[PDB]
Amino acid sequence: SRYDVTLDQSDAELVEEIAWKLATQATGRPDDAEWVEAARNAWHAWPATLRRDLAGFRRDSGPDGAIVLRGLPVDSMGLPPTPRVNGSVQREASLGAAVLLMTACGLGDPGAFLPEKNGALVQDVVPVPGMEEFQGNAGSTLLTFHNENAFHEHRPDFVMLLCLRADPTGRAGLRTACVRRVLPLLSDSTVDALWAPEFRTAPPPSFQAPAPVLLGDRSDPDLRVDLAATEPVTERAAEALRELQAHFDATAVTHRLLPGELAIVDNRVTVHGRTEFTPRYDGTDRWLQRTFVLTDLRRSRAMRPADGYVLGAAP
Numbered sequence: 001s002r003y004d005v006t007l008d009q010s011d012a013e014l015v016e017e018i019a020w021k022l023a024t025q026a027t028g029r030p031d032d033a034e035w036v037e038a039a040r041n042a043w044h045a046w047p048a049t050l051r052r053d054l055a056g057f058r059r060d061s062g063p064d065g066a067i068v069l070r071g072l073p074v075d076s077m078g079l080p081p082t083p084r085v086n087g088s089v090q091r092e093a094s095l096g097a098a099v100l101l102m103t104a105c106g107l108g109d110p111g112a113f114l115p116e117k118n119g120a121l122v123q124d125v126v127p128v129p130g131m132e133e134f135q136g137n138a139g140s141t142l143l144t145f146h147n148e149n150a151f152h153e154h155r156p157d158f159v160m161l162l163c164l165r166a167d168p169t170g171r172a173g174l175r176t177a178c179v180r181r182v183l184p185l186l187s188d189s190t191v192d193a194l195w196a197p198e199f200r201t202a203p204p205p206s207f208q209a210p211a212p213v214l215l216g217d218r219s220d221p222d223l224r225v226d227l228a229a230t231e232p233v234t235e236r237a238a239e240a241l242r243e244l245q246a247h248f249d250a251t252a253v254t255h256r257l258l259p260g261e262l263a264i265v266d267n268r269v270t271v272h273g274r275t276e277f278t279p280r281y282d283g284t285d286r287w288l289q290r291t292f293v294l295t296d297l298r299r300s301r302a303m304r305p306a307d308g309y310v311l312g313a314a315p
């Protein structure tokens with residue numbers, strides 16, 4: 001499958017060399033524009049095979065709206081214990097930051113939101129004691145299906161998750177479900193409901209009108225939904241969300257990520273969630289790093305002071 005790519009040894013070694021050079025030699029640190037520039041330049045040193053694979057995915061993300069790359073460099077011997085604080089981010093140069101920011105610059109540009117993880121471009125996904133029930137990075141209860149930052153006009157176009165350390169307990173898996181798999185299975189009444197402006201997705205409290213869930217083309221729509229946050233404004237809308245959830249559940253691909261695996265989710269067409277797990281809280285738990293990609297950074301300029309990578313309020 002061209003949506004499941006394992007790097008061959010030659011390509012894996014080259015990307016490792018490139019990532020280490022960026023991580024150790026580039027001036028500044030990942031959130032600095034000069035480091036993102038070094039990452040952009042380093043991306044273009046990647047093997048053509050992988051650049052072609054990513055370009056193909058950007059053009060058409062396929063029936064599941066997701067790709068996984070396996071065999072990317074991660075510093076397993078050098079990895080510290082899994083962080084255990086909420087809001088954990090990667091401010092220092094590292095191999096994980098190098099891989100994520102290079103790939104972001106290949107697909108578009110990286111971006112982040114000031115009210116979420118303090119606008120860091122590379123964010124940790126790690127379980128935190130006391131946050132078990134949270135619908136977010138720090139939680140370990142079932143994470144309900146959603147588009148990332150569904151409320152936001154400039155929500156991520158892609159969400160990238162690089163696995164540093166697998167969940168040792170075997171119960172955690174990333175779940176992705178694409179509107180392309182479910183649209184043909186939905187009832188006419190549900191489809192009609194999802195095109196109507198009868199859903200309210202209010203911003204989270206940290207970020208300080210009724211609209212449709214389905215967007216764009218009738219046969220190949222985008223979608224905008226968060227099954228935790230999106231509120232139906234009518235009864236048919238409520239029924240539509242229940243049917244949509246059911247079909248997401250039935251058609252979702254579930255992935256237990258392993259070190260060196262990079263999952264890239266097309267957030268225009270694919271929702272994601274996560275199964276429940278019981279953290280150990282002993283430094284050995286699941287550790288992903290996450291970076292958002294904007295396919296056209298220019299569109300959010302009004303929200304990006306100094307033409308930076310951190311989106312805040314407009315106008």
Ligand code: NA
Nearest residue numbers: 146147148272
């Ligand atoms: Na998410």
